[PDB]
PDB file of C-alpha atoms (C1' of nucleotides) in Angstrom:
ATOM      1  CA  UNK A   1     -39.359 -30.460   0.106  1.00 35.44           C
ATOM      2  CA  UNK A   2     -37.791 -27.374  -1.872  1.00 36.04           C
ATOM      3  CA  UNK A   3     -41.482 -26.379  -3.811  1.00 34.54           C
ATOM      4  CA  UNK A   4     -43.066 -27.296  -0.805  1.00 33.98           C
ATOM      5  CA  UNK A   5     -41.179 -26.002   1.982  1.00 34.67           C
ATOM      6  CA  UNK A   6     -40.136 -23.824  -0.514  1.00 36.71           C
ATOM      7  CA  UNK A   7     -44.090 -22.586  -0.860  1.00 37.41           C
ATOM      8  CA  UNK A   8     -45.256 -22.687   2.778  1.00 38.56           C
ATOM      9  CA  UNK A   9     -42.545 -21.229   4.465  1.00 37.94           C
ATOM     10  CA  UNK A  10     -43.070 -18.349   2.313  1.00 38.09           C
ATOM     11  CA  UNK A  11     -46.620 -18.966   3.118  1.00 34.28           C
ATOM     12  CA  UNK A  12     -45.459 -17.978   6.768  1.00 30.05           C
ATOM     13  CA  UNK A  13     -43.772 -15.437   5.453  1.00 31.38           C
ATOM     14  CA  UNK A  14     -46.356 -13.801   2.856  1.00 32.52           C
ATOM     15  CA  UNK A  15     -48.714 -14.010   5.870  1.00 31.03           C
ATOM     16  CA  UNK A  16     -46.940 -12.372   8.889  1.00 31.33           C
ATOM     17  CA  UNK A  17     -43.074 -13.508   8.520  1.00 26.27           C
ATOM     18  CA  UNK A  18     -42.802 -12.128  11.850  1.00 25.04           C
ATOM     19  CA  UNK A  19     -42.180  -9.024  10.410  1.00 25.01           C
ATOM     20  CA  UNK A  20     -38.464  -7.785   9.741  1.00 25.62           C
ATOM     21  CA  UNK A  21     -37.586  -8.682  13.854  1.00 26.07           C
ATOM     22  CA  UNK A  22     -37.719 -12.389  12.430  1.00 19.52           C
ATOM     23  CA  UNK A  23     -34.928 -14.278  13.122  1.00 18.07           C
ATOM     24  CA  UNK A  24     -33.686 -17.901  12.694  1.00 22.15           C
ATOM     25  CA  UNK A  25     -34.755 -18.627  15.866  1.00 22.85           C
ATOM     26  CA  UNK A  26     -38.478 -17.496  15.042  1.00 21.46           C
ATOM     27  CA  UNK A  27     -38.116 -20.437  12.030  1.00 20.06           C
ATOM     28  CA  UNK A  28     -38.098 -23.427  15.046  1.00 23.91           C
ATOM     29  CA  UNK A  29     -40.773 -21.161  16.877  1.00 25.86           C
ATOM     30  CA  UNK A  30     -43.124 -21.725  13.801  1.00 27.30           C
ATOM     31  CA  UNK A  31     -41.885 -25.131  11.935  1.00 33.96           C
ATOM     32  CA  UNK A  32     -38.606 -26.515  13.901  1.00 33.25           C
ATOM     33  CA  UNK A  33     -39.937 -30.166  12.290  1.00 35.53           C
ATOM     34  CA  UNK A  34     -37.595 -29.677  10.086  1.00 33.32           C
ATOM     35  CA  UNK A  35     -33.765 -31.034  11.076  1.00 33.18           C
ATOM     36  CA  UNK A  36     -31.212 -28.486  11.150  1.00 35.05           C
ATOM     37  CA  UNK A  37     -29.129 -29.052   7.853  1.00 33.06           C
ATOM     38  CA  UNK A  38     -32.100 -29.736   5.714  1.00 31.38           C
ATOM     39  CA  UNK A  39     -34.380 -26.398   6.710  1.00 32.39           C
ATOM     40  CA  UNK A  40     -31.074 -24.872   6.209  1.00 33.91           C
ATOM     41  CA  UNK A  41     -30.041 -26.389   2.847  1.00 36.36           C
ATOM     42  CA  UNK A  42     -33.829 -25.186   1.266  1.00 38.99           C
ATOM     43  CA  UNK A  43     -33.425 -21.405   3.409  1.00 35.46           C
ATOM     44  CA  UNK A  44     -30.275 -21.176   1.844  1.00 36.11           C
ATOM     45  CA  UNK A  45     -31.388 -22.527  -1.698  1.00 36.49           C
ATOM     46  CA  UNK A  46     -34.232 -20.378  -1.440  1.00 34.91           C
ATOM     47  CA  UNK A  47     -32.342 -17.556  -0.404  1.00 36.71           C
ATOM     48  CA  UNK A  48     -30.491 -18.473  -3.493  1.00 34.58           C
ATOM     49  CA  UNK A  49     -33.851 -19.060  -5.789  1.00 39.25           C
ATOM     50  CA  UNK A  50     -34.853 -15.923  -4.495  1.00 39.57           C
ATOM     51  CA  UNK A  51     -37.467 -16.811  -2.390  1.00 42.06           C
ATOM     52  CA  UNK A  52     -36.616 -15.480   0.890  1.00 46.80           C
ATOM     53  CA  UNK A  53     -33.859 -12.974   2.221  1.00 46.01           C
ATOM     54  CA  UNK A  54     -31.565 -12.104   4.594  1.00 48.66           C
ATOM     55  CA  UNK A  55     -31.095  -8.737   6.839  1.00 50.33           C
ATOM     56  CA  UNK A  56     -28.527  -8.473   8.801  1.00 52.00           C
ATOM     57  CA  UNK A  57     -29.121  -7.154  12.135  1.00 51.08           C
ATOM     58  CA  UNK A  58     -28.841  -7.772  15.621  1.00 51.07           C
ATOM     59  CA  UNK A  59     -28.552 -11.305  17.071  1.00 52.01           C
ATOM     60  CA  UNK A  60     -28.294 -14.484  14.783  1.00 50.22           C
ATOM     61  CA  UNK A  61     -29.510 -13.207  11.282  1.00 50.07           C
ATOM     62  CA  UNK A  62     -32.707 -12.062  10.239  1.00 51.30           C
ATOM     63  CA  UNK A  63     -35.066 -13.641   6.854  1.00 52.20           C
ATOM     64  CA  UNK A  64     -37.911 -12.078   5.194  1.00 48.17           C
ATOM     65  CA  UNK A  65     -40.322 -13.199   2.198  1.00 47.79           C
ATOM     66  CA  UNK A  66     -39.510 -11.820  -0.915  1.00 48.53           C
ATOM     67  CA  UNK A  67     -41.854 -12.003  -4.286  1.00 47.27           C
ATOM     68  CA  UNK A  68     -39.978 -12.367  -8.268  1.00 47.84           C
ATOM     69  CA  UNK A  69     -40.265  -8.187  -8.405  1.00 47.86           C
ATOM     70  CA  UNK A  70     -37.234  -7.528  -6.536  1.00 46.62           C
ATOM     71  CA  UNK A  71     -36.126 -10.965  -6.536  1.00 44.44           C
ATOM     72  CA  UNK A  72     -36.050 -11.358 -10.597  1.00 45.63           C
ATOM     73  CA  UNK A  73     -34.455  -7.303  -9.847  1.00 48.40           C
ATOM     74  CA  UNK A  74     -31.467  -8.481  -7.963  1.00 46.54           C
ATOM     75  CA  UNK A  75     -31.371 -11.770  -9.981  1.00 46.78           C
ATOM     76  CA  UNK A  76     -31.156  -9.703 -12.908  1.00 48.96           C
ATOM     77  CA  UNK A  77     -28.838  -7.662 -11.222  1.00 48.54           C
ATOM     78  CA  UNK A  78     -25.048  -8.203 -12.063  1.00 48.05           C
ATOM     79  CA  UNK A  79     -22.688 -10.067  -9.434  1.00 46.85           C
ATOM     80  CA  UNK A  80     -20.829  -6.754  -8.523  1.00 48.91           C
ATOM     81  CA  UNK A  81     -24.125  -5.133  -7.864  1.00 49.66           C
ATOM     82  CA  UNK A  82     -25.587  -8.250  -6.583  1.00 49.67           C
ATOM     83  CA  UNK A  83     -24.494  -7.389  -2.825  1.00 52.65           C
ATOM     84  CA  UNK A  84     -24.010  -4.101  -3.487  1.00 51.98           C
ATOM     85  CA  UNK A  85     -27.290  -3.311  -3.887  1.00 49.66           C
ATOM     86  CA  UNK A  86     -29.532  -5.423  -1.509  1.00 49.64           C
ATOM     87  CA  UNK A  87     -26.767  -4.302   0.863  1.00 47.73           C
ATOM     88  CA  UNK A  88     -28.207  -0.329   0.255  1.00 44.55           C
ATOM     89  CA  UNK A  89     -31.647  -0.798   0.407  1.00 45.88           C
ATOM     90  CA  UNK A  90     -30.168  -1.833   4.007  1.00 43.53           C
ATOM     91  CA  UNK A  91     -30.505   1.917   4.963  1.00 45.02           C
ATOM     92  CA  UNK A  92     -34.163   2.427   3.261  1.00 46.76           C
ATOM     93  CA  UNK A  93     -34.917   5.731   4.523  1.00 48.09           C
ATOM     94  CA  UNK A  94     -31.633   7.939   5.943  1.00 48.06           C
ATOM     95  CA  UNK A  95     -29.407   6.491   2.014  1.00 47.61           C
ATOM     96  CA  UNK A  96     -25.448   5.440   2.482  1.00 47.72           C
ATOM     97  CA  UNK A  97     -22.872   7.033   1.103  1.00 46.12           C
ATOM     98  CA  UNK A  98     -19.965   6.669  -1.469  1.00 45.34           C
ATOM     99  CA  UNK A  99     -17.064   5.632   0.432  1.00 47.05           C
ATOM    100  CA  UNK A 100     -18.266   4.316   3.132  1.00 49.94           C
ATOM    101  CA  UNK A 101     -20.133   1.681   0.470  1.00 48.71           C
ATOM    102  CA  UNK A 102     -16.134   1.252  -0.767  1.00 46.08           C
ATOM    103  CA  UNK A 103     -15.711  -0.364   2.860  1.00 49.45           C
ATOM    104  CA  UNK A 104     -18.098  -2.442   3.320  1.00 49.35           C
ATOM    105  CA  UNK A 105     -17.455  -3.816  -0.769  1.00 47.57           C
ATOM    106  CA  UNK A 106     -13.926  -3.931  -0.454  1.00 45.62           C
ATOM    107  CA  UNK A 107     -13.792  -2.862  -3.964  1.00 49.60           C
ATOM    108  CA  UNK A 108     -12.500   0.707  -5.900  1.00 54.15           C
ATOM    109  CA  UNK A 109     -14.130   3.665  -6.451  1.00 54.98           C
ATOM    110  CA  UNK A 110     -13.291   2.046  -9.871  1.00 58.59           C
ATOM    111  CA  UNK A 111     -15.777  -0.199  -9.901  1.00 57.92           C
ATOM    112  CA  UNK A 112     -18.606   1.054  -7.403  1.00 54.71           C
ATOM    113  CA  UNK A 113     -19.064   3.763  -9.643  1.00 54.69           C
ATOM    114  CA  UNK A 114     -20.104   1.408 -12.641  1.00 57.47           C
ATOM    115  CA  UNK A 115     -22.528  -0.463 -11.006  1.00 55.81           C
ATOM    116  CA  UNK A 116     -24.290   2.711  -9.266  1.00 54.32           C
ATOM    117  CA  UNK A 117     -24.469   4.400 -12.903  1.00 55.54           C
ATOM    118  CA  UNK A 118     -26.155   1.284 -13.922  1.00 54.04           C
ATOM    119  CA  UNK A 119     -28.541   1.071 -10.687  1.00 54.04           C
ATOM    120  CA  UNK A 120     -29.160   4.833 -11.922  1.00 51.19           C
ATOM    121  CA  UNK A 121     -30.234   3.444 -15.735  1.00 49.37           C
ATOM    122  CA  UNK A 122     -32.003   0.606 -13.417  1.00 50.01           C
ATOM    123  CA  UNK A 123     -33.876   4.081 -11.334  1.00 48.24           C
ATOM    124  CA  UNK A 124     -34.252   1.392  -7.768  1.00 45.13           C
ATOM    125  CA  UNK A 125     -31.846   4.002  -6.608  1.00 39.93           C
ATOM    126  CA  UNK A 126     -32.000   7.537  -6.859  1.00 40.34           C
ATOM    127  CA  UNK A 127     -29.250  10.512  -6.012  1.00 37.45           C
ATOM    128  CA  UNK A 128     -29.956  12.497  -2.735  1.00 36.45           C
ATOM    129  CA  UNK A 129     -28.346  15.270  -2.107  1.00 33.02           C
ATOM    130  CA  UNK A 130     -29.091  15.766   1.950  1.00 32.03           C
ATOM    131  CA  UNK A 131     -28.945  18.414   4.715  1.00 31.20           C
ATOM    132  CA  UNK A 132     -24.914  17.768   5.585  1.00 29.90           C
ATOM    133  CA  UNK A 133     -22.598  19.211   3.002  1.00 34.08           C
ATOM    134  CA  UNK A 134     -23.421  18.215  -0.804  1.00 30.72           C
ATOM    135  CA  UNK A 135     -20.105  16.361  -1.155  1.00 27.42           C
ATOM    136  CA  UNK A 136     -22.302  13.183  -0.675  1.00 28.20           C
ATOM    137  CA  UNK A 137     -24.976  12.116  -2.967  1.00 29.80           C
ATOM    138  CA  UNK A 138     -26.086   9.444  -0.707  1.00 30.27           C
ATOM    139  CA  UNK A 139     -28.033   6.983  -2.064  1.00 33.51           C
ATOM    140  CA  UNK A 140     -31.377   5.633  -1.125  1.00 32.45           C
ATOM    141  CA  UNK A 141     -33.936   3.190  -2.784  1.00 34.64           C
ATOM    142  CA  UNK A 142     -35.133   4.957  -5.937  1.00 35.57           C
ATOM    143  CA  UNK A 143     -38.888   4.597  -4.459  1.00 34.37           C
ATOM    144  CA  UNK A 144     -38.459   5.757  -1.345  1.00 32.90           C
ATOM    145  CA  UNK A 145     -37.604   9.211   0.384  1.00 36.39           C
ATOM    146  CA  UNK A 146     -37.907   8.915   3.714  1.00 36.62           C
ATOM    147  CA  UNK A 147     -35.072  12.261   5.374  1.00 37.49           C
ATOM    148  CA  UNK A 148     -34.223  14.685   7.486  1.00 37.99           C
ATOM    149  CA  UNK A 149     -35.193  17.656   5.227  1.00 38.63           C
TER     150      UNK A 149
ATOM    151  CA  UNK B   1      43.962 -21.893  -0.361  1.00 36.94           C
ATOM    152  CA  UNK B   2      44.393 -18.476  -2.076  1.00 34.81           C
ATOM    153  CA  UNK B   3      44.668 -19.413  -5.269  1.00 37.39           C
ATOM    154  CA  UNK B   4      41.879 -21.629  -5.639  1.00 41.09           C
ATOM    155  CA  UNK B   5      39.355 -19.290  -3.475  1.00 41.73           C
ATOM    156  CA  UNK B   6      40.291 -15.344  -4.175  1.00 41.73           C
ATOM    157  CA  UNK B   7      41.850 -13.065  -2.338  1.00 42.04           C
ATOM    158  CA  UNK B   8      38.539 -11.086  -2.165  1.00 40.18           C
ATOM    159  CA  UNK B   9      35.172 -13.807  -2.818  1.00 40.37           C
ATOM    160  CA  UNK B  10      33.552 -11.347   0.397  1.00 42.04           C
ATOM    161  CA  UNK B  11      32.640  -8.879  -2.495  1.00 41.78           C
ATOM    162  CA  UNK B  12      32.827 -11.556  -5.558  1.00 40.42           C
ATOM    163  CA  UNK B  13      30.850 -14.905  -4.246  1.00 37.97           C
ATOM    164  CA  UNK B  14      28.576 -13.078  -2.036  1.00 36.65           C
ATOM    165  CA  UNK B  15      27.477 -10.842  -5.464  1.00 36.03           C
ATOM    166  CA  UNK B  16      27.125 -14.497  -7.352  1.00 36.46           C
ATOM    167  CA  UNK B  17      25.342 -16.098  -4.830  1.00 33.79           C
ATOM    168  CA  UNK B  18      22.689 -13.069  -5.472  1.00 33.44           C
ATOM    169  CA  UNK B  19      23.079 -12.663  -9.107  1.00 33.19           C
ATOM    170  CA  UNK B  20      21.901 -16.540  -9.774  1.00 33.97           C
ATOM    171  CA  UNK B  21      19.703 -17.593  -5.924  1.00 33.04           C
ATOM    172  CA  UNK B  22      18.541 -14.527  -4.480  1.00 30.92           C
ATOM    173  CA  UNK B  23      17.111 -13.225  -7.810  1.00 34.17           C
ATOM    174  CA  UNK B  24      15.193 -16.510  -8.517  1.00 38.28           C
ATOM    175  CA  UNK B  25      13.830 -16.054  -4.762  1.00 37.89           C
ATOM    176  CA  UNK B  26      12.440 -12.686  -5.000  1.00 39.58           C
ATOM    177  CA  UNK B  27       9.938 -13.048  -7.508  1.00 39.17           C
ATOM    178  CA  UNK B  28       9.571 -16.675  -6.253  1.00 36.48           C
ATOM    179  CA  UNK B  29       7.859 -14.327  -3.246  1.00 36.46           C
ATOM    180  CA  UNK B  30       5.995 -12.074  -5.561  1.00 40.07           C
ATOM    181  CA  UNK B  31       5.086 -14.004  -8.768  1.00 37.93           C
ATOM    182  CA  UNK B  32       1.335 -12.878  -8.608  1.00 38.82           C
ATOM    183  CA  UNK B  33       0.393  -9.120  -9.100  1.00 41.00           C
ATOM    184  CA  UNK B  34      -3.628  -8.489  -9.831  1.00 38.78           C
ATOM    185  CA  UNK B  35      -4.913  -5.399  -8.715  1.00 38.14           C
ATOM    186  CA  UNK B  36      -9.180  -5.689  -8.311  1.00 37.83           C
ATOM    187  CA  UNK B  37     -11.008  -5.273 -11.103  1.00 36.83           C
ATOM    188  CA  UNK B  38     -12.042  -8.356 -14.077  1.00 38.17           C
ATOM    189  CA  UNK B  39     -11.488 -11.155 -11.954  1.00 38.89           C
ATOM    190  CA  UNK B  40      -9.362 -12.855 -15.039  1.00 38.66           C
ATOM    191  CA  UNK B  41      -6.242 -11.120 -15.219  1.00 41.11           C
ATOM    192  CA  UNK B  42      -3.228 -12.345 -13.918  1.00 42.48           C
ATOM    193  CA  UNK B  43       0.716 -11.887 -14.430  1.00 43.95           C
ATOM    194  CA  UNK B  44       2.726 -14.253 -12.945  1.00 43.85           C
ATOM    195  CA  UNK B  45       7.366 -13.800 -13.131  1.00 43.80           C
ATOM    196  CA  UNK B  46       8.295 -17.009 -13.407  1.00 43.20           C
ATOM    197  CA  UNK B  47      12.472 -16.779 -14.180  1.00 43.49           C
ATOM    198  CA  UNK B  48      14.965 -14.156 -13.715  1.00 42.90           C
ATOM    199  CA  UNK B  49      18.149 -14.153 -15.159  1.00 44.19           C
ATOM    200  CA  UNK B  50      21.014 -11.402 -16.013  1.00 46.37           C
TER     201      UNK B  50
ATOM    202  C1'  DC C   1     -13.194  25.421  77.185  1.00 45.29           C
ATOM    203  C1'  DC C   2     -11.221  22.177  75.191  1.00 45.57           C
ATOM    204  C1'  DA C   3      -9.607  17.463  72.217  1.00 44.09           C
ATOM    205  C1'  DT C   4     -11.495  16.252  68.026  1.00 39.63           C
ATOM    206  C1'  DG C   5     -11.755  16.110  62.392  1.00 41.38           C
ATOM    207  C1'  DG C   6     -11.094  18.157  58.353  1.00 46.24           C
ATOM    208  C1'  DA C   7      -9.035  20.925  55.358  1.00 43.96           C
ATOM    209  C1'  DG C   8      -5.875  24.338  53.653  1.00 39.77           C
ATOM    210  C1'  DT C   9      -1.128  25.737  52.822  1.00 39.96           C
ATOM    211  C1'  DC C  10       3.302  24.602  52.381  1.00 39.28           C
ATOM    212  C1'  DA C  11       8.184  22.103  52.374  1.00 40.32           C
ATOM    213  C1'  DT C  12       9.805  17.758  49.626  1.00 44.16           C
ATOM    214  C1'  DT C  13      10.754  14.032  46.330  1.00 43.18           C
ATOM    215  C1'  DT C  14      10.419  11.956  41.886  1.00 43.17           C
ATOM    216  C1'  DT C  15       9.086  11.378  38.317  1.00 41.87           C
ATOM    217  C1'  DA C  16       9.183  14.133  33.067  1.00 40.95           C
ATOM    218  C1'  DT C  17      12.793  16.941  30.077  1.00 43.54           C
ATOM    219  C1'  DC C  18      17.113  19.787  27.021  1.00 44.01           C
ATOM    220  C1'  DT C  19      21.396  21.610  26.094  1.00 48.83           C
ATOM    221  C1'  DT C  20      25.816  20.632  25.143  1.00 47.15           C
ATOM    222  C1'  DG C  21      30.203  17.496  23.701  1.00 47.92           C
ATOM    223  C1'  DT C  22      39.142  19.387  21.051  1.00 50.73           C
ATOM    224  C1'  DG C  23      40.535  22.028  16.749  1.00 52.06           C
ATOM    225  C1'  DT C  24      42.068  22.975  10.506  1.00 49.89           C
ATOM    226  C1'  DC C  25      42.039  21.687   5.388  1.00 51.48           C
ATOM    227  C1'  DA C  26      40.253  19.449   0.989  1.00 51.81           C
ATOM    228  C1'  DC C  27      36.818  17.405  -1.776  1.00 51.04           C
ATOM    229  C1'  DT C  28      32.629  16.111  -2.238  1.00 51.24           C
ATOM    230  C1'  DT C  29      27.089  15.338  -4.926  1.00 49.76           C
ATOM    231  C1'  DA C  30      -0.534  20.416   1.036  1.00 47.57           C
ATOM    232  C1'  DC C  31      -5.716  14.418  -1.753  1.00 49.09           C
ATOM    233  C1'  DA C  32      -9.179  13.075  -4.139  1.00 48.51           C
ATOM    234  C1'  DG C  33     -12.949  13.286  -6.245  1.00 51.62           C
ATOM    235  C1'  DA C  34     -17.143  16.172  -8.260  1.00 53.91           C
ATOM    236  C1'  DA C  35     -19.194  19.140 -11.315  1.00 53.70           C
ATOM    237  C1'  DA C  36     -19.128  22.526 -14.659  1.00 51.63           C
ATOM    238  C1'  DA C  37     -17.193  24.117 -19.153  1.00 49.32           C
ATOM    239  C1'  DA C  38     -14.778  23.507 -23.673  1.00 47.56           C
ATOM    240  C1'  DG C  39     -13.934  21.252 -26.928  1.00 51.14           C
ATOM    241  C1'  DT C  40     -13.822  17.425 -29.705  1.00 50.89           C
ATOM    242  C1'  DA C  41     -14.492  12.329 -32.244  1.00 53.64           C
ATOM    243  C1'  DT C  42     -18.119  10.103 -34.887  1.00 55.66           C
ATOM    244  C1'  DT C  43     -21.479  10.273 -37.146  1.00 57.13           C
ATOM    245  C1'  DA C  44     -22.650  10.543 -43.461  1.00 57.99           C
ATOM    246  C1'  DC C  45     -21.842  12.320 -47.486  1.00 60.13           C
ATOM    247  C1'  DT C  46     -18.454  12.920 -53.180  1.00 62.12           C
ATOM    248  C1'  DA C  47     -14.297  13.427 -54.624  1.00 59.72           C
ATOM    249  C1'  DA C  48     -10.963  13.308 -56.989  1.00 59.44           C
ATOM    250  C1'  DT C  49      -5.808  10.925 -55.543  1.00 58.84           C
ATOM    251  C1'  DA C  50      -1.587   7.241 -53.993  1.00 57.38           C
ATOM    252  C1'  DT C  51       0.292   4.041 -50.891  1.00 56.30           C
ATOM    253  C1'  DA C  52      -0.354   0.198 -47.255  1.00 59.17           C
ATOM    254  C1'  DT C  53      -2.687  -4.141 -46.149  1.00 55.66           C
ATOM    255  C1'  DG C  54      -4.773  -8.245 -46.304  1.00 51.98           C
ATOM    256  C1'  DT C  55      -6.498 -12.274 -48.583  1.00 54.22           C
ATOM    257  C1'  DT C  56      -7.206 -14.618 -51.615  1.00 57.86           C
ATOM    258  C1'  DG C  57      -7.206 -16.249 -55.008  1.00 55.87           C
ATOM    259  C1'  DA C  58      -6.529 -16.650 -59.221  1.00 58.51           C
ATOM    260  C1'  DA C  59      -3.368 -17.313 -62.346  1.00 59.22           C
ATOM    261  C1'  DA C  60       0.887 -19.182 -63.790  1.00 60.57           C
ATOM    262  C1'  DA C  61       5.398 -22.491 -63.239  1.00 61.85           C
TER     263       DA C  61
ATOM    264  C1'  DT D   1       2.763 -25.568 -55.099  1.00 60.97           C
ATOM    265  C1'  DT D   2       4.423 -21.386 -55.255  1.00 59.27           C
ATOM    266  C1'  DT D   3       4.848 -17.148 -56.878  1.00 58.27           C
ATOM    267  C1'  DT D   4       3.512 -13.034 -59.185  1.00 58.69           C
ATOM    268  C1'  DC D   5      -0.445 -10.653 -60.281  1.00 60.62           C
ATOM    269  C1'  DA D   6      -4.309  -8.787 -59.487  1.00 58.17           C
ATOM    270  C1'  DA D   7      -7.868  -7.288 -57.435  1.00 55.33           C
ATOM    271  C1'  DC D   8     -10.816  -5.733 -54.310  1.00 53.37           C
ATOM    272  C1'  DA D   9     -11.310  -3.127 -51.002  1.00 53.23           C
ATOM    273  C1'  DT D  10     -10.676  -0.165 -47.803  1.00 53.93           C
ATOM    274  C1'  DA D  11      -8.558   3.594 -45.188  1.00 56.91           C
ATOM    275  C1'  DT D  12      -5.891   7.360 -45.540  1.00 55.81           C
ATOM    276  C1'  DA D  13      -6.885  13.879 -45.691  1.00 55.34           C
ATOM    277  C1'  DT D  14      -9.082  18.180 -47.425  1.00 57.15           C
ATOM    278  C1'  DT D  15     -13.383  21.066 -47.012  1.00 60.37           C
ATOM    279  C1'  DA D  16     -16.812  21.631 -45.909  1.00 58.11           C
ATOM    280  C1'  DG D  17     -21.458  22.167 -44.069  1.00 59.80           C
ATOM    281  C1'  DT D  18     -24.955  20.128 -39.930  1.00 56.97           C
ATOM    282  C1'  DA D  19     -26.580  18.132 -35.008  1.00 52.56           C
ATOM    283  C1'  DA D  20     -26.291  15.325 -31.852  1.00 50.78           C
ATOM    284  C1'  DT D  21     -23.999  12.399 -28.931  1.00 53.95           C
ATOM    285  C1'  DA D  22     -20.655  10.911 -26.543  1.00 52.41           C
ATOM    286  C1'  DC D  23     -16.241  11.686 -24.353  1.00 50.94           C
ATOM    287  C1'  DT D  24     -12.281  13.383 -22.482  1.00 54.29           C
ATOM    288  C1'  DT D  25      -9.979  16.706 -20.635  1.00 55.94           C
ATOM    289  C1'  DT D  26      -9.543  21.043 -18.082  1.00 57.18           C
ATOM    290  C1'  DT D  27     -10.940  24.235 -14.064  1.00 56.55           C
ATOM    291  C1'  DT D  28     -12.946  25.126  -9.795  1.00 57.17           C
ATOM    292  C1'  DC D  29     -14.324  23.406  -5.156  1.00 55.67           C
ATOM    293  C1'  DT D  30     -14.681  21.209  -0.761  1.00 54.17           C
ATOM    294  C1'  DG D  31     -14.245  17.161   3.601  1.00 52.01           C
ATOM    295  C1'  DA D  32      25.395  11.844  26.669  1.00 51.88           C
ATOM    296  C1'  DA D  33      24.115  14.667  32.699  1.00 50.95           C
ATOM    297  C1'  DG D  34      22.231  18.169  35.501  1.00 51.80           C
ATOM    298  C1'  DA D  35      18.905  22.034  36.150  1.00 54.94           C
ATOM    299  C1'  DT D  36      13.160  22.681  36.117  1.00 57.10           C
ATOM    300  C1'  DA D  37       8.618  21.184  37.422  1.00 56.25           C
ATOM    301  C1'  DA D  38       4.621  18.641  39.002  1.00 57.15           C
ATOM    302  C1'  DA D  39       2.595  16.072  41.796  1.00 58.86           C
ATOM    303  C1'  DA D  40       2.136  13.035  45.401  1.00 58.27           C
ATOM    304  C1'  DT D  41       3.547  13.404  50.733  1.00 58.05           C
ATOM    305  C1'  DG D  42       2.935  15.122  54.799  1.00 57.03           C
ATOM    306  C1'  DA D  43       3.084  18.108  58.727  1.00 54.98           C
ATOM    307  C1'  DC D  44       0.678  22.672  60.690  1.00 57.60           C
ATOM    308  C1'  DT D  45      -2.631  24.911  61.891  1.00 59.03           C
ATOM    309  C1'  DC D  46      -7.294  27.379  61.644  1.00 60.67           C
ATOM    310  C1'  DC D  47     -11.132  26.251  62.820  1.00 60.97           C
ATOM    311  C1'  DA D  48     -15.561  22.700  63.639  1.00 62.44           C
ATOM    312  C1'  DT D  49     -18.204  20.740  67.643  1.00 64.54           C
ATOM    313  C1'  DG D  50     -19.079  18.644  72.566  1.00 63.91           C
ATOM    314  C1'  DG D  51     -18.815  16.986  78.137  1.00 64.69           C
TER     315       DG D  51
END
DNA sequence: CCATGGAGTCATTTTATCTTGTGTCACTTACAGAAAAAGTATTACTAATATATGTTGAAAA
DNA sequence: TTTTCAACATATATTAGTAATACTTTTTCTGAAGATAAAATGACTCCATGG
């Protein structure tokens, strides 16, 4: 059921989740009662109401709980920024960099720009200016600052 | 034979046969031309003539 | 003490390479973005002027 | 109905003063054949031990 699947598999999730090494495989380790396309139709709906996530990482793909603070945040985040940013909170500690965000977007520096001066209005992502040359400003998650010097 | 067909179509029917297909097929291969930025935008050739 | 094994040097090919190619007229036609600095466009005021401009509409035919 | 008016209004430009903001610029500032050779080929020989 989407509330109620939706509610107790975060409930697995607000409790351990199996920390960030979960995987989709860890889902039929816990609950694989469900069949495939339907646990799959509420992760992604939920993934899309913004009730779990999605790292990417290693083998298969990894899912996390998420709560309406950063959920309602990237919700209420635009559609340019909407990948964009979960996609640099990725890094978390060490920041990513201008151009090589341009890559992975496969937009401008046109654009990027925008949507980073509006993630700076937004302060979940601050300007770091790091041991290697300052050419960068690499960008990290406005809370957290986590570096090499 | 000559009279009807020219002594020179090489340089005169190959030119037409540009001037009015060719031309058409050109932009017929590039109609399209958005560049990536505000997803509605579009300009699309649709005739060519001289 | 001597035949052996192993290597060290030393001719020897076969591959990778570069300089040429008759003479004479006579016309011809350094990447891009980042930051700092400089400067400015609104952003209100009268306050006179006199076109443009739009609309509209009212007024007349 | 249509046309002329009118009329309403609102920019338009000057000169100011602010003051503050926002916004573009600019200016640094860096992240064709036949010699020549090189090497693989191989034979020679110094020099090793052992029956």
């Amino acid at each position: 059921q989407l509330s109620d699947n939706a509610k107790t598999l975060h409930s697995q999730m607000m409790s351990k989740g199996i920390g960030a090494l979960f995987t989709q495989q860890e889902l039929q380790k816990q609950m694989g009662i469900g069949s495939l396309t339907d646990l799959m139709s509420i992760v992604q709906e939920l993934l899309d109401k913004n009730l779990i996530k999605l790292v990417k990482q290693n083998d298969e793909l990894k899912f996390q709980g998420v709560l309406e603070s950063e959920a309602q945040k990237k919700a209420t985040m635009s559609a340019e920024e909407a990948l964009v940013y979960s996609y640099i909170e990725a890094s978390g500690r060490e920041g990513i960099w201008s151009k090589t965000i341009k890559a992975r977007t496969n937009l401008h520096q046109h654009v990027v720009l925008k949507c980073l001066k509006s993630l700076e209005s937004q302060r979940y992502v601050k300007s770091v200016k790091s041991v290697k040359f300052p050419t960068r400003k690499i960008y990290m998650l406005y809370s957290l600052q986590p570096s090499v010097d | 034979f000559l009279k009807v067909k020219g002594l020179v179509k090489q340089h005169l029917d190959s030119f037409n046969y540009f001037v009015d297909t060719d031309l058409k097929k050109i932009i017929k291969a590039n109609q399209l031309i958005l560049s990536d930025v505000d997803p509605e935008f579009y300009l699309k050739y649709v005739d060519i003539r001289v």
